[PDB]
From Swiss-Prot, chain B:
Keywords annotated in UniProt: Archaeal flagellum
Family membership: Belongs to the archaeal flagellin family.
Record protein name field: Probable flagellin 1
Role played: Flagellin is the subunit protein which polymerizes to form the filaments of archaeal flagella.
GO CC annotations, alphabetized: archaeal-type flagellum
Annotated organism of origin: Aeropyrum pernix (strain ATCC 700893 / DSM 11879 / JCM 9820 / NBRC 100138 / K1)
Domain of life (superkingdom): Archaea
Keyword Nucleus found: no
Keyword RNA-binding set for record: no
Amino acid sequence: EKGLLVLELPTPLNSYEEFKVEVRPVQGAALTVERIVPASLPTGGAVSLG
Amino acid sequence: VGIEAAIVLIAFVIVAAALAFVALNMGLFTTQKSKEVMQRGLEEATSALEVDGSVIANVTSGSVDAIAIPIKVSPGREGVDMSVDKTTVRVMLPSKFYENAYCGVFDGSSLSDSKLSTITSSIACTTGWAYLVIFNGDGDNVLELGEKGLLVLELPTPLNSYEEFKVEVRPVQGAALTVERIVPASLPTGGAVSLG
């Protein structure tokens, strides 16, 4: 099974600032995700964060 | 006899579980950060930025006033950010040294036309002189492939004949660009003069 975890953020996240996302299951290791928004952002559509 | 052995076994298993939890969590985090850092290194490898063409200067009253330096992005795409807060331009003059003369990037809407006088006159900066003008761009402050950039200096009463000047651009990512030219002996009373 493939899972895609989605965040709906109302008016955060301009250019160049970092964010941190952590998942805490009842069993197993917590997952840590940290990414930085790139300088080049299109006017619409998805942008890859690497 | 058995019961205390079972209790010790339970304790030792629980300790091992905590160690495993910590190990997997930190290993996943460090693998992700290694991925990110090597991706950033690959990004830094490209995005060179280079001079495309000849530097062209504006001369008034027998002295060089403004300097236009044409630049483009190197092969590999991966555009260079030209924002005000991320790029610094260094100007080294025979009697002056400026660490940061960058004022920003204004879109090249072609103005009334592509005159050097029109570009130098219509655009003004609140602080500093050097600005970059993008051509054929999409309106962003990032110089990408397919976009032509012309970096302009507004120099108040430097640059007579025969003395050298040095201009350096310092992007946040990628190699710094070094430009050095010498003013020729023959300067017209007006209009642009080529610096080669």
